[PDB]
Amino acid sequence: VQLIKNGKKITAFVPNDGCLNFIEENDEVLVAGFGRKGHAVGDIPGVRFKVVKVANVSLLALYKGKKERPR
Amino acid sequence: KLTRIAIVNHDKCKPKKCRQECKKSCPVVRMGKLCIEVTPQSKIAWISETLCIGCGICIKKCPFGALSIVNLPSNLEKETTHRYCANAFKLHRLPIPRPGEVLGLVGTNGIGKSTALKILAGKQKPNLGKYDDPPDWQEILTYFRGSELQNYFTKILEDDLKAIIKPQYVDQIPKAAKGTVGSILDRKDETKTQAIVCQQLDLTHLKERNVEDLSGGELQRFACAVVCIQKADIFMFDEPSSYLDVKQRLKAAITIRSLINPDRYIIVVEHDLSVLDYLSDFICCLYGVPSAYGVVTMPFSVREGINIFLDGYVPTENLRFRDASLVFKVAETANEEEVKKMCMYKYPGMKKKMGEFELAIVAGEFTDSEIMVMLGENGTGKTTFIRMLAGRLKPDEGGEVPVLNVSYKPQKISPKSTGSVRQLLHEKIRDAYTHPQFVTDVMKPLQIENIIDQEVQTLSGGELQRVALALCLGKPADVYLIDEPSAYLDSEQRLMAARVVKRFILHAKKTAFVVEHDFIMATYLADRVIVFDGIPSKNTVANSPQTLLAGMNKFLSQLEITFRRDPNNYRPRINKLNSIKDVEQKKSGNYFFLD
Amino acid sequence: WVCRKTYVTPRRPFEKSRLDQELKLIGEYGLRNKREVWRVKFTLAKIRKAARELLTLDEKDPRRLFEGNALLRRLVRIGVLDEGKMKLDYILGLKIEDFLERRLQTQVFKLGLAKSIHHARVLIRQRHIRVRKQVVNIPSFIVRLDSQKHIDFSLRSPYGGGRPGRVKRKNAKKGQGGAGAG
Amino acid sequence: MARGPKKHLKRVAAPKHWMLDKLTSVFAPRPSTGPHKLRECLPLIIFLRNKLKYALTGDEVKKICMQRFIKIDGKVRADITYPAGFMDVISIDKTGENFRLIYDTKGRFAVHRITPEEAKYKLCKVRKIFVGTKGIPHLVTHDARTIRYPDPLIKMNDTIQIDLETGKITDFIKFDTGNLCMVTGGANLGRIGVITNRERHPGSFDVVHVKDANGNSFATRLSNIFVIGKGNKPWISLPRGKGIRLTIAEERDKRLAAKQSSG
Amino acid sequence: KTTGFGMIYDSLDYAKKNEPKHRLARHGLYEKKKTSRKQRKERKNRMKKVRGTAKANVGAG
Amino acid sequence: FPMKQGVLTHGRVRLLLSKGHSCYRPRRTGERKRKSVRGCIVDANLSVLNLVIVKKGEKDIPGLTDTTVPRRLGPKRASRIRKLFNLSKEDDVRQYVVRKPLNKEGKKPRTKAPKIQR
RNA sequence: UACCUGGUUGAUCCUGCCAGUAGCAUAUGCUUGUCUCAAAGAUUAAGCCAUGCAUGUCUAAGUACGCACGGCCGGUACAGUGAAACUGCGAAUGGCUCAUUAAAUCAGUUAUGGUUCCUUUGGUCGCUACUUGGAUAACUGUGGUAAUUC
RNA sequence: GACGACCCAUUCGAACGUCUGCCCUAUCAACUUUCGAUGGUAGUCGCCGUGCCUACCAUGGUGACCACGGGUGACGGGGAAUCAGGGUUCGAUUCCGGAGAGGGAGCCUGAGAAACGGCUACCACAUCCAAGGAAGGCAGCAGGCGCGCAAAUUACCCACUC
RNA sequence: CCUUUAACGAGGAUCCAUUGGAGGGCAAGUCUGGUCGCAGCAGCCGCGGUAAUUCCAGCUCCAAUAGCGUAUAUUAAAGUU
Numbered sequence A: 001v002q003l004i005k006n007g008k009k010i011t012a013f014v015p016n017d018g019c020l021n022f023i024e025e026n027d028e029v030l031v032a033g034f035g036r037k038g039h040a041v042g043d044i045p046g047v048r049f050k051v052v053k054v055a056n057v058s059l060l061a062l063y064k065g066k067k068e069r070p071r
Numbered sequence B: 001k002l003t004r005i006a007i008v009n010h011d012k013c014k015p016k017k018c019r020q021e022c023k024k025s026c027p028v029v030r031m032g033k034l035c036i037e038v039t040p041q042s043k044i045a046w047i048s049e050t051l052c053i054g055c056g057i058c059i060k061k062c063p064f065g066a067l068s069i070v071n072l073p074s075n076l077e078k079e080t081t082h083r084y085c086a087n088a089f090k091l092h093r094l095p096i097p098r099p100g101e102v103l104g105l106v107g108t109n110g111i112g113k114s115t116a117l118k119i120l121a122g123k124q125k126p127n128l129g130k131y132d133d134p135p136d137w138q139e140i141l142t143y144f145r146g147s148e149l150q151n152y153f154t155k156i157l158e159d160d161l162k163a164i165i166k167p168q169y170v171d172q173i174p175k176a177a178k179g180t181v182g183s184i185l186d187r188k189d190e191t192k193t194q195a196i197v198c199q200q201l202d203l204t205h206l207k208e209r210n211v212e213d214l215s216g217g218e219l220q221r222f223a224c225a226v227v228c229i230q231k232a233d234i235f236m237f238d239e240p241s242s243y244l245d246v247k248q249r250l251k252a253a254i255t256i257r258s259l260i261n262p263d264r265y266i267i268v269v270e271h272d273l274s275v276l277d278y279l280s281d282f283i284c285c286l287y288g289v290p291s292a293y294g295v296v297t298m299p300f301s302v303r304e305g306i307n308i309f310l311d312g313y314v315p316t317e318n319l320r321f322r323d324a325s326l327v328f329k330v331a332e333t334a335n336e337e338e339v340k341k342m343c344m345y346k347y348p349g350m351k352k353k354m355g356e357f358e359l360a361i362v363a364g365e366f367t368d369s370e371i372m373v374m375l376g377e378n379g380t381g382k383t384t385f386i387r388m389l390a391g392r393l394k395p396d397e398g399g400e401v402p403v404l405n406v407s408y409k410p411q412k413i414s415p416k417s418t419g420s421v422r423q424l425l426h427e428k429i430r431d432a433y434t435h436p437q438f439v440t441d442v443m444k445p446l447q448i449e450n451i452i453d454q455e456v457q458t459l460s461g462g463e464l465q466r467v468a469l470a471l472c473l474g475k476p477a478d479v480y481l482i483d484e485p486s487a488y489l490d491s492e493q494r495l496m497a498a499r500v501v502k503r504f505i506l507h508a509k510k511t512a513f514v515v516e517h518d519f520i521m522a523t524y525l526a527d528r529v530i531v532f533d534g535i536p537s538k539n540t541v542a543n544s545p546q547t548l549l550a551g552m553n554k555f556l557s558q559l560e561i562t563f564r565r566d567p568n569n570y571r572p573r574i575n576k577l578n579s580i581k582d583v584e585q586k587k588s589g590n591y592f593f594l595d
Numbered sequence C: 001w002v003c004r005k006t007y008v009t010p011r012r013p014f015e016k017s018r019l020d021q022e023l024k025l026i027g028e029y030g031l032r033n034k035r036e037v038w039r040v041k042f043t044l045a046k047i048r049k050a051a052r053e054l055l056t057l058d059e060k061d062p063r064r065l066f067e068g069n070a071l072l073r074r075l076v077r078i079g080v081l082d083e084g085k086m087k088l089d090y091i092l093g094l095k096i097e098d099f100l101e102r103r104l105q106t107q108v109f110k111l112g113l114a115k116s117i118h119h120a121r122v123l124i125r126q127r128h129i130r131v132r133k134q135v136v137n138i139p140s141f142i143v144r145l146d147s148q149k150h151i152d153f154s155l156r157s158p159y160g161g162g163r164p165g166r167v168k169r170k171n172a173k174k175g176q177g178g179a180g181a182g
Numbered sequence D: 001m002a003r004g005p006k007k008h009l010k011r012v013a014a015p016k017h018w019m020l021d022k023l024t025s026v027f028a029p030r031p032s033t034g035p036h037k038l039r040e041c042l043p044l045i046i047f048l049r050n051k052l053k054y055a056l057t058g059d060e061v062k063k064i065c066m067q068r069f070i071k072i073d074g075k076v077r078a079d080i081t082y083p084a085g086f087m088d089v090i091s092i093d094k095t096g097e098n099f100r101l102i103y104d105t106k107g108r109f110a111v112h113r114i115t116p117e118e119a120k121y122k123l124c125k126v127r128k129i130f131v132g133t134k135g136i137p138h139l140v141t142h143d144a145r146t147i148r149y150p151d152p153l154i155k156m157n158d159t160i161q162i163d164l165e166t167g168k169i170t171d172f173i174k175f176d177t178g179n180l181c182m183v184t185g186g187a188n189l190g191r192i193g194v195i196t197n198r199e200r201h202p203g204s205f206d207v208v209h210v211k212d213a214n215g216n217s218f219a220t221r222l223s224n225i226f227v228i229g230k231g232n233k234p235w236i237s238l239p240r241g242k243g244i245r246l247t248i249a250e251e252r253d254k255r256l257a258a259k260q261s262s263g
Numbered sequence E: 001k002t003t004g005f006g007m008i009y010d011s012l013d014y015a016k017k018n019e020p021k022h023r024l025a026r027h028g029l030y031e032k033k034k035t036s037r038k039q040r041k042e043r044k045n046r047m048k049k050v051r052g053t054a055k056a057n058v059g060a061g
Numbered sequence F: 001f002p003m004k005q006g007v008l009t010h011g012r013v014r015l016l017l018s019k020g021h022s023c024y025r026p027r028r029t030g031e032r033k034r035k036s037v038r039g040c041i042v043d044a045n046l047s048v049l050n051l052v053i054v055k056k057g058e059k060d061i062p063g064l065t066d067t068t069v070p071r072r073l074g075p076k077r078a079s080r081i082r083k084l085f086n087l088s089k090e091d092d093v094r095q096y097v098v099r100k101p102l103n104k105e106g107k108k109p110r111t112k113a114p115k116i117q118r
Numbered sequence G: 001u002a003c004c005u006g007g008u009u010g011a012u013c014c015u016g017c018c019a020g021u022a023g024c025a026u027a028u029g030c031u032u033g034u035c036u037c038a039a040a041g042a043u044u045a046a047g048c049c050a051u052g053c054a055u056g057u058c059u060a061a062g063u064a065c066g067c068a069c070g071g072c073c074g075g076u077a078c079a080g081u082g083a084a085a086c087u088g089c090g091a092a093u094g095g096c097u098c099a100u101u102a103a104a105u106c107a108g109u110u111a112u113g114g115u116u117c118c119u120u121u122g123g124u125c126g127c128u129a130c131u132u133g134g135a136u137a138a139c140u141g142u143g144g145u146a147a148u149u150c
Numbered sequence H: 001g002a003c004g005a006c007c008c009a010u011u012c013g014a015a016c017g018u019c020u021g022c023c024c025u026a027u028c029a030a031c032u033u034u035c036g037a038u039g040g041u042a043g044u045c046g047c048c049g050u051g052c053c054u055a056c057c058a059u060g061g062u063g064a065c066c067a068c069g070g071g072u073g074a075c076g077g078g079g080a081a082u083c084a085g086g087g088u089u090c091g092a093u094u095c096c097g098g099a100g101a102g103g104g105a106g107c108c109u110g111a112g113a114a115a116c117g118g119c120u121a122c123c124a125c126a127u128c129c130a131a132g133g134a135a136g137g138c139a140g141c142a143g144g145c146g147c148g149c150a151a152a153u154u155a156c157c158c159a160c161u162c
Numbered sequence I: 001c002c003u004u005u006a007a008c009g010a011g012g013a014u015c016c017a018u019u020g021g022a023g024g025g026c027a028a029g030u031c032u033g034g035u036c037g038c039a040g041c042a043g044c045c046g047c048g049g050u051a052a053u054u055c056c057a058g059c060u061c062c063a064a065u066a067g068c069g070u071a072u073a074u075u076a077a078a079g080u081u
């Protein structure tokens, strides 16, 4: 991902199974840290950030099926 | 929610001293698709419209502040004051009916202006999304709580503000109602103000005359008169200035201007040139897509709003696309092949009469493969003459029969043909000069497909005028009779269509008698001009046909009114009745500058 | 304006020993949540802190006298402490359960007309009791000592004099429109 | 903010001896300029609806004062605010009432009703002696009266009885040890007791010991002392309380003894 | 129980003079007009921009 | 652009103006604006001029000097009445005031007078 | 409540950090019956702004010949009511923002015997005259400018 | 009774001045001076005291007890969160003091302003125009655009409080 | 709005409580089906290579509750300033 307000690049994890498909290339996303506040978490190296919302819609409601893609 | 896009040209936007960071740090131009196209070169940076996701990253780290960020118009289920149902028009905002000034309401055709007036009037109440299981004088007041329209709508309820509107159309009425001469308007109401209205309406003629003998002028006059004399609180004028003389239009705007000042609310529409300067004091512009969605922008000052509406796209404050030169024809072009051969006809100086009219024609040259323009004042005898030449009544002595079949353009258009427009298009033919033609009037930007289907009963003014424009180059005929095509069209739609009509009838070899009241409509469409001179309900002389310039000078010498050329954009601007320069032009007799 | 919390959370999140005490205490008195427990224990531990000051102050300091005298009066006025005690050492012998005896729902059950404690809370909320002349709806009244001899049912209720409920008068109208005309 | 003088005083900026609440709005009355200082004033309207409760809104006081039932220091005043302070007399002649502004032992302006005969004069401290033009003297007082030709032995920190009718003082007290004094400012306020001793320091902020008839000794600055009459013999009437300055424990004992909160 | 606050005047004219207007109009003998709010301010600013004659704006808008 | 005195050659000049000068209206006390004005010296660049008749000729111009309109108002002050009708110091002015008719009112005509001062 | 627990080894005891735990305040996800109290474009851009409004003011008592209303007839200070206009006073108070600012700001403490002070309150008020001088507005009437509280 | 005026006192203040109290940094250790730095003498100016300014004359003043310089997502205080004892962290923000109204400078009026709901000019912006000219400053209440992870009604009203 | 009062207004199927978790730290499954080092979970230690108490689901159970989860600043824990 590239950022809006810096233009620099960050590599961000995507959570649960099949949530990759609900992210489509060249759209906006919202990122957030893992919960270790600077350091790479778990067995995955080089990643320090994860993803929470695709476009005013949560990964949860996309995954669970109580909402649908707005497009 | 909305649209976002980048824009690029600026004072020393210098792709030859910035290394081009816009190309280097754009996310789109990295994933393969070239959104931003640039090199070390002598021109400007090029940036696409369609491929820009929005972002604004290029803007924040371009080394010169050359690239700005626009936001293009789109619907996002926002506000939504009403809809009819689905796959149908919707409107978002109906805004402040500021009192003590007149509110001028200025957008393209089929955009919901009339619909906003219907809602403001309390007659077609707003539905606001849905479907509309809430009304009733509660839920909508709760929805537009915290604002103003609570105080307005509660005052309406209670009919403290009494509603009146001037209707969009003439036709259904002189057909739906009827009118007793004299007695009618009389036991309308009441005194001094009707005398001021009818006298400042500059008529003095139709005091003793039955309605059925009158035309556009008389109609409009009486209408406005009664409307004003109508003792009420609110007041709405839709489209008050259609098919009326240029002199008479100015005196309509000032009789509307009488009602304004002492805690009264007033809404006007219009599709203007530069007369809106005297119509309104607040100008409120509407944007969107014709017959799909309309959005009302917050109101502006008349001077500031006028240009920003015709400028080509003023936002700040939002933003859009399109809009530009249209107050003329700036269609720089001319010349042909060898024009061979032609003729010299010539129609004779007939004398014609009805009852309260002495109408006279002078002999003139009606050239082959060539336009003829009629004016001249309302009541100056133009339309009924053409019918009398073709076949209806006349002549007592002499006449010339049309050599070519004949195409009839009408002005009194309110036709009744039940079924569909597509059925009527079969009484013409859609195979002939099959390569575009109707498609070259309109197809790609404002849509037609848009002109078929649907009913003619529910069709709006400019589209209904376009039905009539098609009915003329659509039976096989080559000599064309057209009265008032400028009726219910704006500037954007009229000028291009008029240029297309001239191109058709001149290029494949024809002749057309055009009866325009529009500087831009008349000019770019003119040649001979023929000039009609004389006083309404007395005497009509068609002046022996002379020069565009000389004939236009005869019309404006008697009227006492003139124009100015907008110097950057070549656009007409009317003068304020009596000014300073309004004296150099009177002396130089010259009412047009820059051929 | 001015706001503050009336309870605190436990430092440990879980602890087998703690949870059983909080559970079984809630069972006896019919309390809704632990927030109704920790509320009590905040007030108590506050009073246990104030007392813990005055014992370390000099004997016959004027601050120590005036505070203690008027404090112990308040503890006696609600009846969590006796006047056969009447000194600051017995503040530290005071504990959580003695408060809960003076709760309204506890006193309804213990000294009045109720079934199980779960019943008695419902009677307080459905407006069938009063305290001297005044309806209440709060089971956390904590009841002053003097007002224990004025706990009575309400004077407009189907329990004692006053209009019946809509279950009875419904069935009365079943004798007239349910089997009398329907 | 400031570029010139201010014209507002809020609720919470205002002093605490007017006993203001906090659930009426942001502003408080603010006394307009006059002879007394705003940390020693009782504004007029605070006497009429936050003490005696004749009026209920400020608009009512505007309708009252115009009728000219109000006097202050035997003259007629006719405004919402006036800065009356310690030792002035209010006089409503319609009700036949007369008040005096004096300090409780709490240290706040009480209701001290008095005979109309007492309300024909007030007690005024001398603060400055100033020789005017052509060999004429002057006095200066805390109520800002300039009384010419005083007796030539009256000096500052004395007090003088002034007849409101004619000015021109009739009599006086001389500042001496063992005379009876009242306090007008500082931490000790409203206490009554005899002078007992004085203490001088060349420089400023000389202090003045005091002792009462309850066997307590305390001291205060010189410029917060006001004389009321000779030893154990005030030349004014005194309210209840009488400068005893009870502890909080004893005040508790009185209330539960009489059992007094009902009549 | 319910608790309120009551006045009793000696004569009518002492009430009619003193009395805040809305309490007199509470059981009618007075009204208000005047007329809503706003129509005042927009007139005021228009009156401001004339001099000598403002009688049009006071009646006339 | 208006013409004022003391503004030699006829260019268009922006002068500081304040109270007690031509072509200024204060909207606040002490206020000073810098408006444009135009010189004294006459040219054909002017819209209109104001000529005051000073000396009257032999002839009478038909539209102006033949027409006769009386001035409206007498004095309001004491001493102007004394100077006008040439009264002595002792005569006690009380009936030497101009009486200004109210022509109609649908009731009756009034005759108004002003109020004497000093 | 002045409290700790998991993780380096085959196992043990240390050193040491990481993780677990509780509070607070901002954002955000999901959910939501009833009752009271109420913070809210500061964080970033002290970025830029359409429209509307936010400061005016007359008593018995400065100045009333508005051809206004009214009058009981007037003007002889002369009416009652009174738009407008001159005059006096206020507009330096409030509201808002936190950019600047490290002995500066600011707080406590002190000083005018180094000074100024509308206003209020109290004192100060004797080395043609039965009332002096001449212009400006409103008002009346004629105008200029595309346009202005010109 | 009403108004006005001269001076003194008073009230509300205003303005300078005393003593003590301050976050990070030495990969900032010497700093300040005829472009007055410190002091003396006289004068000008100012509401007054004063190198505030000018003439003449002297050569001082400050620092390892941290000056000088740089940094601060630093307005200050009354306070807030956590807390056994000792502390740590925060304080744009309802009270008080201060500074500023796009960026700079100058000035009128008044008792009080170097005022921006006053004015003049330059600079950066932006508006109308018949191209001759004219008009503007929402860090006031609402409202819009932009910016961002991030924040409300172009509502009702002077009855309360002032 | 609140309080006060007419008249309607509860048989559990609806006048419907959710948010996280159940290998250890840490309160609660060596239950059933699917997947087979794949997909995923996992602050940490570690789970998945065909018999998974940790994954995807079902059932049951646990915690707090009109609230609960997640990210970040910061204090306590830290006698690791």
Ligand SMILES: Nc1nc2c(ncn2[C@@H]2O[C@H](COP(=O)(O)OP(=O)(O)NP(=O)(O)O)[C@@H](O)[C@H]2O)c(=O)[nH]1
Residues within 6 Å of the ligand: B084, B088, B089, B108, B109, B110, B111, B112, B113, B114, B115, B290, B291, B292, B458, B459, B460, B461, B462, B463, B488
């Ligand atoms: N189906 C349907 N469409 C309607 C109806 N009324 C209006 N419309 C459509 O709504 C759109 C706008 O209508 P209107 O407000 O009249 O347009 P306008 O802006 O006034 N048009 P114009 O500028 O030409 O004067 C058009 O596409 C029109 O066909 C109706 O009753 N039914």
Ligand SMILES: Nc1nc2c(ncn2[C@@H]2O[C@H](COP(=O)(O)OP(=O)(O)NP(=O)(O)O)[C@@H](O)[C@H]2O)c(=O)[nH]1
Residues within 6 Å of the ligand: B209, B212, B213, B214, B215, B216, B217, B218, B243, B244, B245, B354, B355, B356, B357, B377, B378, B379, B380, B381, B382, B383, B384, B537
């Ligand atoms: N007296 C009379 N007038 C009639 C009769 N029929 C029509 N007229 C009027 O006579 C006039 C003839 O001019 P016309 O060609 O209609 O004018 P126009 O082309 O419509 N001009 P405009 O559109 O500007 O109004 C019109 O005003 C028409 O209404 C009749 O029988 N008697």
Ligand code: SF4
Residues within 6 Å of the ligand: B013, B014, B015, B017, B018, B019, B020, B021, B022, B023, B038, B045, B062, B063, B064, B065, B066, B067
């Ligand atoms: S826009 Fe900014 S960046 Fe893109 S070219 Fe012009 S200057 Fe270089």
Ligand code: SF4
Residues within 6 Å of the ligand: B005, B006, B026, B027, B028, B029, B035, B036, B047, B051, B052, B053, B054, B055, B056, B057, B058, B059
């Ligand atoms: S705007 Fe968003 S998309 Fe269009 S150019 Fe700049 S960055 Fe690329």
Ligand SMILES: [Mg+2]
Residues within 6 Å of the ligand: B110, B114, B168, B460, B461
């Ligand atoms: Mg239409």
